[PDB]
Amino acid sequence: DFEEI
Amino acid sequence: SGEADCGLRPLFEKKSLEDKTERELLESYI
Amino acid sequence: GQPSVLQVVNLPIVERPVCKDSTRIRITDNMFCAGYKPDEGKRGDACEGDSGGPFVMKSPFNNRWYQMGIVSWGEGCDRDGKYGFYTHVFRLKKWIQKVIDQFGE
Amino acid sequence: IVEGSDAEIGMSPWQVMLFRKSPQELLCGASLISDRWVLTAAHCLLYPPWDKNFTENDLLVRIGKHSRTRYERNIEKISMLEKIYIHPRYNWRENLDRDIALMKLKKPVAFSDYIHPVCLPDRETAASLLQAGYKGRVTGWGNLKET
Ligand SMILES: N=C(N)NCCCNC(=O)[C@@H]1CS[C@H]2CC[C@@H](NS(=O)(=O)Cc3ccccc3)C(=O)N21
């Protein structure tokens, strides 16, 4: 769900 | 307590701008 | 759902008695509860994912923001007659001062 | 937050996000009290009934955020943990009494318009403000509904 860091 | 500049937001207290609902907080303190 | 951006909600502190009487859990002095009573007709509550976040107040004397609580537990989220319980930061302040100056910058 | 509204930019510069390294997921909220310390709930790190027991290397701290999902380049700062401190008398067995924990950031974080520490109360501020009826404010990227 979260954008890659 | 807290740090020397603690709790004074760069984008609000420091420019003397108030956020949209802080008045509700201050009005509750009798 | 889960929000797109950070959410905010302003909640009133509730009297200790009203807090003990809404749950079967043993309340201590290191906790305080907050939220609207069913008759107040306003809602709001922290929920899953909000744990550990700050419960803050703005002092009218110096215009600064103080962290009074830490989102702890609740039974459900925004359930009528239920309240959110927060860690009472000031009562645990000596513990906070001590690990800081005994352990660092 | 159930029944809340979207925060304005910079409205809560001390809000920190506890992020798990893998699976990359949001664990909890936290707050910045100085350039090197973050305050959070002990249950975010240790909660045996649910087999939860995180160490420094399992987490990442994301400071200066607005968007839950996005990697906000040039705005947010991500820091690693050096040490985690849980209150010695934290009661997980019964009622989450003394639910508090401090996390030491590996390197001090620089303040900006979006990152700034909150104040910890003193006895007199606590006394005048922690009163029934007085409103406080809570912030988070958590659930919008219980259901
Ligand atoms: N304000 C809210 N409505 N909720 C607070 C944010 C969500 N926090 C939680 O879900 C925490 C994380 S750990 C978990 C332990 C017990 C749980 N509460 S519960 O309904 O089981 C009642 C309970 C309280 C304390 C200890 C044991 C059981 C709870 O709220 N938890």
PDB file of all heavy atoms in Angstrom, chain D residues 34-53:
ATOM      1  N   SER D  34      12.546  16.177  21.288  1.00  0.00           N
ATOM      2  CA  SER D  34      13.833  16.861  21.180  1.00  0.00           C
ATOM      3  C   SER D  34      14.412  16.388  19.855  1.00  0.00           C
ATOM      4  O   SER D  34      13.718  15.626  19.164  1.00  0.00           O
ATOM      5  CB  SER D  34      14.770  16.535  22.344  1.00  0.00           C
ATOM      6  OG  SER D  34      15.238  15.206  22.397  1.00  0.00           O
ATOM      7  N   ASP D  35      15.640  16.793  19.509  1.00  0.00           N
ATOM      8  CA  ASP D  35      16.264  16.377  18.245  1.00  0.00           C
ATOM      9  C   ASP D  35      16.645  14.900  18.181  1.00  0.00           C
ATOM     10  O   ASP D  35      16.859  14.353  17.100  1.00  0.00           O
ATOM     11  CB  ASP D  35      17.491  17.243  17.878  1.00  0.00           C
ATOM     12  CG  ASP D  35      18.673  17.118  18.846  1.00  0.00           C
ATOM     13  OD1 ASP D  35      18.561  16.678  20.007  1.00  0.00           O
ATOM     14  OD2 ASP D  35      19.790  17.482  18.436  1.00  0.00           O
ATOM     15  N   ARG D  36      16.671  14.256  19.339  1.00  0.00           N
ATOM     16  CA  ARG D  36      17.020  12.854  19.440  1.00  0.00           C
ATOM     17  C   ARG D  36      16.059  11.941  20.153  1.00  0.00           C
ATOM     18  O   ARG D  36      16.387  10.760  20.257  1.00  0.00           O
ATOM     19  CB  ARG D  36      18.308  12.668  20.206  1.00  0.00           C
ATOM     20  CG  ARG D  36      19.491  13.267  19.591  1.00  0.00           C
ATOM     21  CD  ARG D  36      20.699  12.566  20.128  1.00  0.00           C
ATOM     22  NE  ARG D  36      20.831  11.186  19.677  1.00  0.00           N
ATOM     23  CZ  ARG D  36      21.946  10.675  19.166  1.00  0.00           C
ATOM     24  NH1 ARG D  36      23.043  11.416  19.034  1.00  0.00           N
ATOM     25  NH2 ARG D  36      21.985   9.393  18.841  1.00  0.00           N
ATOM     26  N   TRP D  37      14.930  12.428  20.662  1.00  0.00           N
ATOM     27  CA  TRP D  37      14.005  11.544  21.378  1.00  0.00           C
ATOM     28  C   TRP D  37      12.596  11.584  20.854  1.00  0.00           C
ATOM     29  O   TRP D  37      12.070  12.636  20.489  1.00  0.00           O
ATOM     30  CB  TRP D  37      13.994  11.846  22.879  1.00  0.00           C
ATOM     31  CG  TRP D  37      15.305  11.625  23.606  1.00  0.00           C
ATOM     32  CD1 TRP D  37      16.296  12.553  23.795  1.00  0.00           C
ATOM     33  CD2 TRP D  37      15.766  10.418  24.251  1.00  0.00           C
ATOM     34  NE1 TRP D  37      17.330  12.005  24.507  1.00  0.00           N
ATOM     35  CE2 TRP D  37      17.039  10.694  24.806  1.00  0.00           C
ATOM     36  CE3 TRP D  37      15.231   9.128  24.410  1.00  0.00           C
ATOM     37  CZ2 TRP D  37      17.797   9.741  25.510  1.00  0.00           C
ATOM     38  CZ3 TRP D  37      15.990   8.165  25.126  1.00  0.00           C
ATOM     39  CH2 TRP D  37      17.259   8.485  25.664  1.00  0.00           C
ATOM     40  N   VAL D  38      12.007  10.398  20.824  1.00  0.00           N
ATOM     41  CA  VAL D  38      10.654  10.183  20.364  1.00  0.00           C
ATOM     42  C   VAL D  38       9.950   9.456  21.513  1.00  0.00           C
ATOM     43  O   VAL D  38      10.488   8.528  22.123  1.00  0.00           O
ATOM     44  CB  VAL D  38      10.679   9.312  19.070  1.00  0.00           C
ATOM     45  CG1 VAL D  38       9.264   8.928  18.574  1.00  0.00           C
ATOM     46  CG2 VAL D  38      11.391  10.092  17.991  1.00  0.00           C
ATOM     47  N   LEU D  39       8.751   9.913  21.815  1.00  0.00           N
ATOM     48  CA  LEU D  39       7.922   9.351  22.854  1.00  0.00           C
ATOM     49  C   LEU D  39       6.834   8.560  22.136  1.00  0.00           C
ATOM     50  O   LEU D  39       6.328   9.061  21.123  1.00  0.00           O
ATOM     51  CB  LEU D  39       7.282  10.497  23.628  1.00  0.00           C
ATOM     52  CG  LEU D  39       6.534  10.280  24.927  1.00  0.00           C
ATOM     53  CD1 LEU D  39       7.448   9.632  25.994  1.00  0.00           C
ATOM     54  CD2 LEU D  39       6.112  11.680  25.343  1.00  0.00           C
ATOM     55  N   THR D  40       6.474   7.372  22.626  1.00  0.00           N
ATOM     56  CA  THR D  40       5.433   6.533  22.027  1.00  0.00           C
ATOM     57  C   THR D  40       4.838   5.696  23.150  1.00  0.00           C
ATOM     58  O   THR D  40       5.210   5.909  24.305  1.00  0.00           O
ATOM     59  CB  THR D  40       6.014   5.616  20.909  1.00  0.00           C
ATOM     60  OG1 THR D  40       4.936   4.948  20.261  1.00  0.00           O
ATOM     61  CG2 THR D  40       6.999   4.569  21.444  1.00  0.00           C
ATOM     62  N   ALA D  41       3.889   4.809  22.842  1.00  0.00           N
ATOM     63  CA  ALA D  41       3.249   3.929  23.827  1.00  0.00           C
ATOM     64  C   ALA D  41       4.068   2.641  23.872  1.00  0.00           C
ATOM     65  O   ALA D  41       4.485   2.154  22.807  1.00  0.00           O
ATOM     66  CB  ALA D  41       1.832   3.605  23.377  1.00  0.00           C
ATOM     67  N   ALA D  42       4.263   2.038  25.042  1.00  0.00           N
ATOM     68  CA  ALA D  42       5.039   0.782  25.129  1.00  0.00           C
ATOM     69  C   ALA D  42       4.391  -0.392  24.398  1.00  0.00           C
ATOM     70  O   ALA D  42       5.114  -1.277  23.952  1.00  0.00           O
ATOM     71  CB  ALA D  42       5.257   0.389  26.537  1.00  0.00           C
ATOM     72  N   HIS D  43       3.064  -0.370  24.240  1.00  0.00           N
ATOM     73  CA  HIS D  43       2.319  -1.436  23.565  1.00  0.00           C
ATOM     74  C   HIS D  43       2.578  -1.508  22.069  1.00  0.00           C
ATOM     75  O   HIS D  43       2.188  -2.480  21.409  1.00  0.00           O
ATOM     76  CB  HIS D  43       0.808  -1.354  23.850  1.00  0.00           C
ATOM     77  CG  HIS D  43       0.028  -0.373  23.021  1.00  0.00           C
ATOM     78  ND1 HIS D  43      -0.453   0.813  23.496  1.00  0.00           N
ATOM     79  CD2 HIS D  43      -0.392  -0.454  21.728  1.00  0.00           C
ATOM     80  CE1 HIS D  43      -1.148   1.426  22.579  1.00  0.00           C
ATOM     81  NE2 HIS D  43      -1.140   0.672  21.487  1.00  0.00           N
ATOM     82  N   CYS D  44       3.169  -0.433  21.547  1.00  0.00           N
ATOM     83  CA  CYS D  44       3.532  -0.322  20.130  1.00  0.00           C
ATOM     84  C   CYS D  44       4.725  -1.230  19.808  1.00  0.00           C
ATOM     85  O   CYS D  44       4.892  -1.710  18.685  1.00  0.00           O
ATOM     86  CB  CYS D  44       3.956   1.102  19.821  1.00  0.00           C
ATOM     87  SG  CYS D  44       2.523   2.190  19.651  1.00  0.00           S
ATOM     88  N   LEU D  45       5.542  -1.462  20.833  1.00  0.00           N
ATOM     89  CA  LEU D  45       6.764  -2.260  20.801  1.00  0.00           C
ATOM     90  C   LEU D  45       6.693  -3.628  21.484  1.00  0.00           C
ATOM     91  O   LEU D  45       7.252  -4.599  20.991  1.00  0.00           O
ATOM     92  CB  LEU D  45       7.862  -1.421  21.477  1.00  0.00           C
ATOM     93  CG  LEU D  45       7.981   0.031  20.971  1.00  0.00           C
ATOM     94  CD1 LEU D  45       8.953   0.806  21.795  1.00  0.00           C
ATOM     95  CD2 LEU D  45       8.374   0.038  19.496  1.00  0.00           C
ATOM     96  N   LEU D  46       6.012  -3.683  22.623  1.00  0.00           N
ATOM     97  CA  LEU D  46       5.872  -4.901  23.382  1.00  0.00           C
ATOM     98  C   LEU D  46       4.434  -5.185  23.822  1.00  0.00           C
ATOM     99  O   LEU D  46       3.815  -4.423  24.581  1.00  0.00           O
ATOM    100  CB  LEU D  46       6.793  -4.825  24.600  1.00  0.00           C
ATOM    101  CG  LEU D  46       6.840  -6.057  25.510  1.00  0.00           C
ATOM    102  CD1 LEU D  46       7.475  -7.255  24.828  1.00  0.00           C
ATOM    103  CD2 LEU D  46       7.648  -5.670  26.721  1.00  0.00           C
ATOM    104  N   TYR D  47       3.888  -6.284  23.317  1.00  0.00           N
ATOM    105  CA  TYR D  47       2.545  -6.673  23.689  1.00  0.00           C
ATOM    106  C   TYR D  47       2.488  -8.183  23.466  1.00  0.00           C
ATOM    107  O   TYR D  47       1.931  -8.657  22.476  1.00  0.00           O
ATOM    108  CB  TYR D  47       1.484  -5.982  22.868  1.00  0.00           C
ATOM    109  CG  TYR D  47       0.150  -6.223  23.511  1.00  0.00           C
ATOM    110  CD1 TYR D  47      -0.073  -5.809  24.827  1.00  0.00           C
ATOM    111  CD2 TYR D  47      -0.875  -6.854  22.830  1.00  0.00           C
ATOM    112  CE1 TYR D  47      -1.291  -6.038  25.466  1.00  0.00           C
ATOM    113  CE2 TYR D  47      -2.092  -7.091  23.452  1.00  0.00           C
ATOM    114  CZ  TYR D  47      -2.289  -6.694  24.772  1.00  0.00           C
ATOM    115  OH  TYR D  47      -3.475  -6.946  25.406  1.00  0.00           O
ATOM    116  N   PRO D  48       3.030  -8.970  24.412  1.00  0.00           N
ATOM    117  CA  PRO D  48       3.077 -10.450  24.418  1.00  0.00           C
ATOM    118  C   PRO D  48       1.788 -11.203  24.038  1.00  0.00           C
ATOM    119  O   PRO D  48       1.858 -12.196  23.319  1.00  0.00           O
ATOM    120  CB  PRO D  48       3.551 -10.762  25.831  1.00  0.00           C
ATOM    121  CG  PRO D  48       4.478  -9.613  26.095  1.00  0.00           C
ATOM    122  CD  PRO D  48       3.567  -8.477  25.699  1.00  0.00           C
ATOM    123  N   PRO D  49       0.599 -10.773  24.499  1.00  0.00           N
ATOM    124  CA  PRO D  49      -0.588 -11.542  24.103  1.00  0.00           C
ATOM    125  C   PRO D  49      -0.741 -11.730  22.576  1.00  0.00           C
ATOM    126  O   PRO D  49      -1.313 -12.712  22.117  1.00  0.00           O
ATOM    127  CB  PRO D  49      -1.719 -10.684  24.647  1.00  0.00           C
ATOM    128  CG  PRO D  49      -1.118 -10.264  25.922  1.00  0.00           C
ATOM    129  CD  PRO D  49       0.175  -9.719  25.438  1.00  0.00           C
ATOM    130  N   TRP D  50      -0.256 -10.749  21.812  1.00  0.00           N
ATOM    131  CA  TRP D  50      -0.308 -10.740  20.350  1.00  0.00           C
ATOM    132  C   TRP D  50       1.060 -11.026  19.735  1.00  0.00           C
ATOM    133  O   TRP D  50       1.294 -10.721  18.559  1.00  0.00           O
ATOM    134  CB  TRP D  50      -0.794  -9.380  19.838  1.00  0.00           C
ATOM    135  CG  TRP D  50      -2.184  -9.019  20.229  1.00  0.00           C
ATOM    136  CD1 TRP D  50      -3.079  -9.792  20.907  1.00  0.00           C
ATOM    137  CD2 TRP D  50      -2.872  -7.789  19.918  1.00  0.00           C
ATOM    138  NE1 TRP D  50      -4.289  -9.131  21.033  1.00  0.00           N
ATOM    139  CE2 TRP D  50      -4.187  -7.904  20.440  1.00  0.00           C
ATOM    140  CE3 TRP D  50      -2.505  -6.614  19.255  1.00  0.00           C
ATOM    141  CZ2 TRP D  50      -5.147  -6.873  20.304  1.00  0.00           C
ATOM    142  CZ3 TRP D  50      -3.454  -5.594  19.126  1.00  0.00           C
ATOM    143  CH2 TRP D  50      -4.763  -5.733  19.647  1.00  0.00           C
ATOM    144  N   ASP D  51       1.961 -11.574  20.545  1.00  0.00           N
ATOM    145  CA  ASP D  51       3.314 -11.899  20.111  1.00  0.00           C
ATOM    146  C   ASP D  51       4.106 -10.730  19.551  1.00  0.00           C
ATOM    147  O   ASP D  51       5.044 -10.939  18.776  1.00  0.00           O
ATOM    148  CB  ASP D  51       3.314 -13.034  19.084  1.00  0.00           C
ATOM    149  CG  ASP D  51       3.017 -14.373  19.705  1.00  0.00           C
ATOM    150  OD1 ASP D  51       3.947 -14.918  20.340  1.00  0.00           O
ATOM    151  OD2 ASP D  51       1.878 -14.866  19.557  1.00  0.00           O
ATOM    152  N   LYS D  52       3.763  -9.522  19.966  1.00  0.00           N
ATOM    153  CA  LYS D  52       4.452  -8.330  19.492  1.00  0.00           C
ATOM    154  C   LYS D  52       5.612  -8.026  20.422  1.00  0.00           C
ATOM    155  O   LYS D  52       5.414  -7.944  21.625  1.00  0.00           O
ATOM    156  CB  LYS D  52       3.475  -7.161  19.459  1.00  0.00           C
ATOM    157  CG  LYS D  52       4.060  -5.877  18.872  1.00  0.00           C
ATOM    158  CD  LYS D  52       3.130  -4.675  19.027  1.00  0.00           C
ATOM    159  CE  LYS D  52       1.757  -4.817  18.393  1.00  0.00           C
ATOM    160  NZ  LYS D  52       0.869  -3.735  18.965  1.00  0.00           N
ATOM    161  N   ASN D  53       6.808  -7.848  19.877  1.00  0.00           N
ATOM    162  CA  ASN D  53       8.021  -7.548  20.641  1.00  0.00           C
ATOM    163  C   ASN D  53       9.122  -7.131  19.664  1.00  0.00           C
ATOM    164  O   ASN D  53       9.925  -7.934  19.177  1.00  0.00           O
ATOM    165  CB  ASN D  53       8.479  -8.753  21.479  1.00  0.00           C
ATOM    166  CG  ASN D  53       9.798  -8.515  22.199  1.00  0.00           C
ATOM    167  OD1 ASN D  53      10.317  -7.405  22.234  1.00  0.00           O
ATOM    168  ND2 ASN D  53      10.347  -9.572  22.786  1.00  0.00           N
TER     169      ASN D  53
END
